[PDB]
Write a protein that binds this DNA or RNA. Structure first.
Ligand SMILES: [Mg+2]
Ligand SMILES: [Mg+2]
Ligand SMILES: [Zn+2]
Lengths: 1112, 158, 104, 221, 105, 14
DNA sequence: CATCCGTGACACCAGG
DNA sequence: TATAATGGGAGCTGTCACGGATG
């Protein structure tokens, strides 16, 4: 079909590589493609250089490192539950200071995980995504004191866990105090330890009123640097012997040690820029020629005094400014953990270096790699930022990779974050999306990187603007930080241009975020596009300018939850971004060069390129995602087809001809339907099931292990006791279900027998054995069966065994078996649908086609949305999307309407006029006039003021059609809906929240160890929680007996629940309950605290709730 | 000290706190049996008192006791009683219960004010003992155990 | 008798020893080979009770007929295993220690 | 430090070693006290680490073996660029070590995990919360045992008093244990052959009633 | 109402040489119009056998007496060199809409 | 406050 | 009769 | 069992109200 595109804005630059924040950062951290001598002092190279050399005697220095090749490819890692990693070797040399003996060796330090092509990892077989972390950029800040108005706090902040925060304050007594490790002491002492004499401080700070006299203390200048040094060491180390080489060591490690204290390169730059100085390293002072030389303290104190006095050019700092908040990408986080592991390794190195042979020590005998290995393995497996990858659809993975968390190690603790961290700061324009963020506790703390935004080398987020010189908009694009952006008047990307010149006497622009009407002579820059303000998900919402931000948030977040359908369709109304999202997410498979397609298969595509080479592209077919959604590729070319470079060869999941296909284009009518779409519920047509719309494939993995036991081996077998041939029908000879079978709840997937315990048969057992004359078998059925409410078609069975080549399981495990069950889920009552504008709803009713409202030509609608969902939610975009979708239904075309610059109402009405001609002149030619019911609806519409009185039926029907409304017939009666109804095509997705996964119930089941209460969760066949507030409900009702049932007979009255089950199966009324076990647990846990809790009677005589079983 | 499905053991922190206590107590009894000087016995008694402290309310005084290779504080007896996860609020004033389930809700406009729509597969399990009894009352099964075995598999349900 | 009140009070050392079924002298939990509770340890069946209903540790008595009997070979009473949830032990300190609740 | 014991626990064990060294010193040898004291101090610290650093105590010789195994695997990985298999470790361990022995030694040295291990980022889930209790019988188990005892009494009442009592005494439904033919015969006052004959005929009548009514088959699983 | 394909165990499969997966092949077969001429006829088992480079359409079904295919241009599969397709499809008389989960034929 | 500090202080007396 | 400080507490279900 | 060896080392960065201590 034709794709008519709206919009007048020209996109000077395309969207950057969307996962570059991941791939580029990890590349820079590893430097694996860089020969060792050319490496920069960044990343793990910088970690090595920081740790080494290791001294004290012997010396172990570091030459270089190298990363070998992965021992296994990515798919094999995914199957064998391995980690995609590369071996890490480091060439180290040992030197004896006296002997001069130099021994050299390449030591192996374990493995480091490698980032896949799309910017994700594989940790123990599970795809993971390291989420970038936003935090306060290191540097020197000046903030207003909350208590004292005219006073200000000077804060000095290094990288997280790379030095202590320092505070400088003008106390109420006049002296200038410094706070370090929560110790307030006069700064004059440290200034004296730096070698500052009263001469220099008086000539440097005297200009600022009487403030310098707060720095004048005679008892401090009376002593030389060493005495003041020991004085400060005593003030900072109560009890520690103030030795000279101890005080020097502590002060160096606290203020000048580059291996302990470290501003970032960003902190270095920001200190230099703020204080108007230049720094040598990344610390606050130095140890030069034996004495301490100041770097930062005097400039900071000077700026603080100038801010307190009122000297012009000194202002406080906005700590929410995106020029003072920076991002820590995957590389920086992994490097910090690498540095921690290396420090532990160095501690072990020195340990082995003090007591060894002093001659028979090689680098191998000195390096235990384990402390490093763990420090990496802990980061990728148990960090707050090492998140389980969300690959529901390709867009979900891309969005996950582009996230920004204020949480994590070194981040905000939740329940402690205020409004400021969560606010949309003005500097978020173009850098951080103001829409995509979770609703709930994490609001404003998890955010998304804007579409055109880039993180620079220092960590600050930069956004692009076009240069404008003398009213002429160039094509030179400058990427600015927020601090840089605040210098210029920046016009809006929609200002009218006559081709390269600003063609408006008054243009809308920003000055430090403030909106302002300026002249083209004042414009210094211009925006690139509206797209640069919002994230990728938000950018996929057509008519975004018509939706309130609160529902735009939901429509944005819910595309992440769209399930790949077997017949997925791209939206009839797109934003012009549906292609880049498929391409950058590595969803589809494209052509590497120009050439001719040689072979096309269901599993592979072979292409002959202009170089004569025959390149084979395998197709990933029916693979299971982290969320169970099917990720399969399908060939979209055919044999003999000529293809150019970058042409589509295979559609991935949720991709239609290279366009993002997260749902279906359905025909919606917007009207109530007999209460079946009450309160956001949705009514759908059975036709949607008949043509397999909203049908998705889902695969589940089941796993079992046979291990060695103290009581005999577990063996995976078909020889399961007490089972019929009907129970073992679909089991193969080895006991594993056969590929192709249909498994329902209760069916066996893998047979397993386990030896029983002592199992001393109670006399009933012995007598039953004798009566039936059958020996009690030595093993019992512990087979893996299909859980309740699950099942499908077996598609794979994997079996690994001890003694098989290439296989080695964890100790004790004889064998592992995995079974993959695939199911084709149709839409059912209770499944959740949504559109892109925040309209979400659960399918409440599936009517047969004959009951559906239908057009006069007999076409039934697909979905019935309730109009009451629109006004309160203010998301009129979906309305416009419907109107346009109506035109494209009869013209047979889709559309591209970019956000904030797209289809306007008059153009939609032009298209609607053409559509009405296609829709009605057909009927007028086929020999039919206007219908009687149409005449009645037209009378009603005339009453409503929707059509002009006096025109012909065709004219009024065309007027309605231009308003997007049509006559609609009630399928149950044939009479028309009394008014004309909005009908049109809408893009609707099936979210991941399907009732098939959530319906759960339980009579009785497993109970907890200590509490003897039901377990929680569907997977554990658990019971619902009756919490404090449900108890309050029952109390407020007066349901004393129902509540007592909840507290005793149904949860943890052991005798009570057993007796209740027996009474119910016997037809008897349930017994009165007894003491719940958790109160006995409370009594015993209080006794363990030396507290005697005594249940008494009304005579104050003890009552034994333990029935004598605990009294000697 | 329970054995998980994988054959490995999982245990409560109170065991490690008690082991700390018992080791320090026994070392004190032995240091007193011999003629240990003042400094050593004083250090031992201080460590014993702090062991009792970690057992009864860990983290209350001083740095909280952790396990090797972890920053997580060990869960003492005060932590077991106090908080949203303590014994009172988590297990005594509210419990997880049997004969209970949950599912997605959907409007039913045909219901009368006193009715709801309950899926068959939910109500079967929720009312399962009643269903076994009534199945025995009719001819559907010989006894309760046979009725339960008949309901075990979905294909065996008529 | 019906429960009507619940008193709570401080427990004396004599009261605590009244509760206890035996002093825990060793820091051991279970044997690394047999996976059975060690002697005088934190899980000793001699102190806290039998792991299996009406069955002593060694196995000389394994039926309900013996009830309250204490095996002479291993020292484990023959009662319900449920009592391992109810039977306190104790630890005799070489030096008294303050109850931190009443200190901090 | 780091090897399983607190700094102060290590210090106190070293002090115990220092006491031993004091009581074992000999000043005639002209050696300073530190030289002889360091030996006993190291000995006491290492013995303490071996004896106390494991919730499931492992004898000191087995701890030595497990440490030797760890160091062998570490050297093998330092020379192989990957973690060794069981067979390579068995090679490098010498005679008597096969792969199965390495596997058993690694299995026997597995330390337990905390039931209070956190599950999730919210502070509302423990690893122990998902471990079902296997010891205490379920309501279904107790009800099935009760119905089994009731059906057994229903089947035993169809016998005469003597043969029902003979079966109850021979299987333990009376006083727990199972009696011998001589005991039941001296209790009923007949020959052990006669008590065995009436036990046989009781079992035969029970088999006949069970083939007729089938009221006890489902309990046999 | 049912489809068997040689060397195909279940619906989530591919066939070498065939571009369409089995899911798409069954979706195509769902559009097959089959007219019965005999009134008392209830079930017909169409047999299809194809190979080589060809676009297997609905005509390629071996003809059965008193059975006509009303949409013979209906695409079925796109076989390449060496791709073989051997199907047995089953057409029944019926009324209304009956999903596969309810008849399991 | 810090038992290691306290012990290292008591040790520095002898 | 003030300020300073140590210690409490900070929604529910679901799945984790 | 014996050369001599003699004081550690992280820490890493809420928000409020309340009752008790101090100053
Ligand atoms: Mg060997
Ligand atoms: Mg929860
Ligand atoms: Zn015994």
């Amino acid at each position: 079909m034709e794709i008519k595109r709206f919009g007048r804005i020209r996109e000077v630059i395309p969207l950057p590589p969307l996962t570059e924040i991941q791939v580029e950062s990890y590349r820079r951290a590893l430097q694996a493609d860089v020969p060792p001598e050319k490496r920069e002092n960044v990343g793990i190279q910088a970690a090595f250089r920081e740790t080494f050399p290791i001294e004290e005697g012997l010396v172990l220095d570091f030459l270089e490192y190298r990363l070998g090749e992965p021992p296994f490819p990515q798919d094999e890692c995914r199957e064998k539950d391995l980690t995609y990693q590369a071996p890490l070797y480091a060439r180290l040399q040992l030197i004896h200071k006296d002997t001069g003996l130099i021994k050299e060796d390449e030591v192996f330090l374990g493995h480091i995980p490698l980032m896949t092509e799309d910017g994700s990892f594989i940790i123990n077989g599970a795809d993971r995504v390291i989420v970038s972390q936003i935090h306060r950029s290191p540097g020197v800040y000046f903030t207003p004191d909350p208590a004292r108005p005219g006073r200000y706090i000077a804060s000095i902040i290094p990288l997280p866990k790379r030095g202590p925060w320092i505070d400088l304050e003008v106390e109420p007594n006049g002296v200038v105090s410094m706070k370090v490790n929560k110790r307030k002491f006069p700064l004059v002492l440290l200034l004296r330890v730096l070698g500052y004499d009263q001469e220099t401080l008086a000539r440097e700070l005297g200009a600022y009123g009487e403030l310098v006299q707060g720095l004048m203390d005679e008892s401090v200048f009376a002593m030389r640097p060493e005495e003041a040094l020991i004085r400060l060491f005593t003030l900072l180390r109560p009890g520690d012997p103030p030795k000279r080489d101890k005080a020097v060591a502590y002060v160096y490690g606290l203020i000048a040690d580059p291996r302990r204290y470290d501003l970032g390169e960003a902190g270095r730059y920001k200190a230099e820029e703020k204080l108007g100085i230049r720094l040598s390293g990344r610390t606050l002072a130095r140890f030069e020629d034996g004495e301490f030389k100041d770097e930062v303290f005097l400039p900071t104190l000077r700026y603080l005094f100038a801010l307190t006095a009122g000297v012009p050019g000194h202002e406080v700092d906005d700590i929410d400014h995106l020029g003072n908040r920076r991002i820590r990408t995957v590389g920086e986080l992994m490097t910090d953990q690498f540095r921690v592991g290396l420090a532990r390794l160095a501690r072990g190195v020195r340990e082995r270096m003090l007591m060894g042979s002093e001659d028979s020590l090689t680098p191998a005998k000195l390096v235990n790699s384990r402390p490093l290995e763990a420090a990496i393995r802990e980061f990728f497996s148990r960090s707050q930022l090492s998140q389980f990858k969300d690959e529901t659809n390709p867009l979900s993975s891309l969005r996950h990779k582009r996230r920004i968390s204020a949480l994590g190690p070194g981040g905000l603790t939740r329940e402690r974050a205020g409004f400021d961290v969560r606010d949309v700061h003005r500097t978020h324009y173009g850098r951080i999306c103001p829409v995509e963020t979770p609703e709930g506790a994490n609001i404003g703390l998890i955010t998304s990187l804007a579409a055109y935004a880039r993180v620079d080398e220092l960590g600050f987020i930069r956004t692009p603007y076009r240069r404008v010189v003398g009213g002429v908009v160039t094509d030179e694009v400058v990427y600015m930080t927020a601090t840089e952006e605040d210098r210029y008047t920046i016009a809006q990307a929609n200002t009218p241009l006559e081709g390269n010149r600003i063609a408006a006497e008054r243009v809308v622009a920003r000055r430090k975020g403030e909106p302002v009407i300026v002249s083209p002579e004042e414009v210094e820059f211009m925006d690139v596009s509206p797209k640069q303000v919002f994230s990728v998900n938000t950018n996929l919402i057509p008519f975004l300018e018509h939706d309130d931000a609160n529902r735009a948030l939901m429509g944005s977040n819910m595309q992440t939850q769209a399930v790949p359908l077997i017949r997925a369709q791209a939206p009839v109304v797109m934003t012009g971004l549906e292609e880049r999202v498929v391409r950058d997410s590595l969803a589809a498979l494209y052509a590497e060069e120009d050439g001719e397609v040689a072979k096309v298969d269901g599993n592979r595509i072979v292409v002959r390129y202009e170089d004569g080479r025959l390149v084979e592209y395998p197709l990933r077919r029916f693979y299971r995602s982290n969320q169970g959604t099917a990720l399969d590729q399908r060939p979209r070319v055919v044999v003999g087809q000529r293809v150019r470079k970058g042409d589509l060869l295979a559609d991935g999941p949720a991709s239609e001809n290279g366009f993002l296909a997260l749902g279906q284009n359905v025909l919606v009518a917007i009207m109530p339907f007999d209460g079946y779409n009450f309160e956001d519920a949705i009514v759908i047509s059975e036709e949607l099931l008949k043509r397999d719309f909203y049908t998705s494939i889902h695969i589940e993995r089941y796993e079992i292990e046979a291990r060695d036991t103290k009581l005999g081996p577990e063996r995976i077998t078909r020889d399961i006791p007490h089972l019929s041939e009907a129970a073992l029908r679909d089991l193969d000879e080895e006991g594993v279900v056969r590929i192709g079978a249909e498994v329902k709840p209760g069916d066996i997937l893998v047979g397993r027998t386990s030896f029983k315990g002592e199992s001393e048969p109670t006399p009933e057992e012995r007598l039953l054995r004798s009566i039936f004359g059958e020996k009690a078998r030595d093993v019992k059925d512990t087979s893996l069966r299909v859980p309740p409410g699950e099942g499908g078609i077996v598609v794979r069975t994997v079996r690994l065994r001890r003694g098989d080549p290439g296989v080695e399981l964890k100790p004790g495990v004889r064998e592992v078996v995995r079974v993959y069950v695939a199911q084709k889920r149709k839409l059912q009552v209770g499944d959740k649908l949504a559109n892109r504008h925040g309209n979400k709803g659960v399918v409440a009713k599936i009517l047969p086609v004959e009951d559906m409202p239908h057009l006069p030509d007999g076409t039934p609608v697909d979905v019935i949305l309730n109009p009451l969902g629109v006004p309160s939610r203010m998301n009129l975009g979906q309305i416009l999307e419907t109107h346009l979708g109506l035109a494209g239904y009869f013209l047979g075309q889709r559309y591209i309407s970019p956000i904030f610059d797209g289809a306007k109402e008059p153009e939609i009405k032009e298209l609607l006029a053409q559509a009405f001609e296609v829709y009605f002149g057909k009927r007028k030619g086929e020999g039919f006039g206007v219908d009687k019911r149409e005449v009645e609806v037209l009378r009603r519409a005339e009453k409503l003021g929707l059509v002009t009185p006096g025109k012909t039926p065709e004219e009024q029907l065309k007027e309605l059609f231009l308003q997007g409304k049509v006559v609609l017939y009630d399928g149950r009666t044939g009479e028309p809906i009394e008014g004309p109804i909005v009908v049109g095509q809408m893009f609707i997705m099936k979210l991941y929240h399907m009732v098939e996964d959530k319906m759960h119930a339980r009579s009785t089941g497993p109970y907890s160890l200590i509490t003897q209460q039901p377990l929680g969760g569907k997977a554990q066949f658990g019971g619902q929680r009756f919490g404090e507030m449900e108890v309050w409900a029952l109390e407020a009702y007066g349901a004393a007996h129902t509540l007592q049932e909840m507290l005793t007979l149904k949860s943890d009255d052991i005798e009570g629940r057993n007796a209740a089950y027996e009474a119910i199966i016997k037809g008897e009324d349930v017994p009165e309950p007894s003491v719940p076990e958790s109160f006995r647990v409370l009594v015993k846990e209080l006794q363990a605290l030396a507290l005697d809790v005594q249940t008494l009677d009304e005579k104050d005589n003890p009552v034994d709730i333990f029935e004598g079983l605990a009294s000697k | 000290m329970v054995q998980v499905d994988g054959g490995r053991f999982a245990t409560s922190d109170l065991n490690d706190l008690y082991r700390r206590l018992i080791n320090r107590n026994n070392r004190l009894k032995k240091l007193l049996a011999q003629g240990a000087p003042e400094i050593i016995i004083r250090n031992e008694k201080r460590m014993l008192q702090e062991a009792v402290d970690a057992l009864l309310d860990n983290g209350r005084r001083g740095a909280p006791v952790t396990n090797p290779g972890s920053d997580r504080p060990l869960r003492s007896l005060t932590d077991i009683l106090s908080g949203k996860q303590g014994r009172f609020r988590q297990n005594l004033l509210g419990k997880r219960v049997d004969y209970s389930g949950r599912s997605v809700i959907v409007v039913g406009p045909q219901l009368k004010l006193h009715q709801c729509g309950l899926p068959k597969r939910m109500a079967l399990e929720l009312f399962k003992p009643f269903l076994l009894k009534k199945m025995e009352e009719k001819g559907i099964a010989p006894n309760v155990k046979a009725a339960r075995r008949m309901l075990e598999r979905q294909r065996d349900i008529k | 008798k019906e429960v009507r009140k619940v008193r709570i009070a401080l427990a004396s050392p004599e009261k605590i020893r009244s509760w206890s079924y035996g002093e825990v002298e060793k820091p051991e939990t279970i044997n690394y080979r047999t996976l059975k509770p060690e002697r005088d340890g934190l899980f000793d069946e001699r102190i806290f009770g039998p792991i299996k209903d009406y069955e002593c540790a060694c196995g000389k008595y394994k039926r309900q007929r013996f009830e309250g009997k204490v095996c002479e070979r291993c020292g484990v009473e023959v009662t319900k295993s449920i009592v391992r949830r109810y039977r306190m032990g104790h630890i005799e300190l070489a030096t008294p220690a303050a109850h931190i609740w009443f200190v901090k | 430090t780091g090897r399983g014991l607190s700094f102060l626990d290590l210090i106190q064990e070293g002090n115990q070693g220092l006491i031993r060294a004091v009581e074992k010193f000999e000043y005639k040898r002209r050696f300073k006290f530190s030289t002889y004291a360091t030996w006993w101090i190291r000995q006491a610290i290492n013995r303490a680490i071996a004896d106390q650093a494991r919730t499931i105590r492992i004898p000191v010789h087995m701890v030595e073996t497990i440490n030797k195994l760890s160091r062998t695997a570490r050297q093998l990985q330092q020379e192989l660029g990957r973690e060794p298999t069981y067979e390579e470790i068995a090679e490098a361990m010498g005679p008597g070590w096969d792969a199965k022995r390495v596997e058993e030694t690694l299995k026997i040295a597995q330390e337990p995990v905390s039931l209070e291990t956190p599950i999730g980022d919210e502070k509302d889930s423990f690893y122990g919360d998902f471990i079902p209790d296997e010891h205490l019988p379920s309501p279904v188990d107790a009800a099935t045992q009760s119905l089994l005892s009731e059906e057994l009494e229903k089947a035993l009442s169809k016998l005469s008093e003597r043969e029902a009592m003979v079966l109850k005494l021979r299987k333990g439904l009376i006083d727990g244990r199972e009696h011998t033919l001589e005991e039941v015969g001296a209790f009923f006052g007949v020959t052990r052959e006669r008590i065995r004959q009436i036990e046989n005929k009781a079992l035969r009548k029970l088999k006949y009633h069970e083939s007729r009514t089938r009221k006890l088959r489902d309990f046999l699983d | 109402t049912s489809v068997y394909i040689e060397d195909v165990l279940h619906e989530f499969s591919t066939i070498p040489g065939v571009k369409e997966d089995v899911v798409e092949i069954i979706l195509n077969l769902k559009e097959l119009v089959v007219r019965f001429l005999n009134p008392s006829l209830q079930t017909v088992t169409l047999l299809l056998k194809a190979e080589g480079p060809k676009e297997v359409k609905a005509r390629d079904f071996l003809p059965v007496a008193d059975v006509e295919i009303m949409n013979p241009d209906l695409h079925i599969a796109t076989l390449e060199e060496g791709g073989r397709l051997n199907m047995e499809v089953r057409v029944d008389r019926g009324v209304g809409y009956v999903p596969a989960e309810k008849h399991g034929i | 406050s810090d038992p290691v500090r306290q012990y290292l202080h008591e040790i520095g007396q002898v």
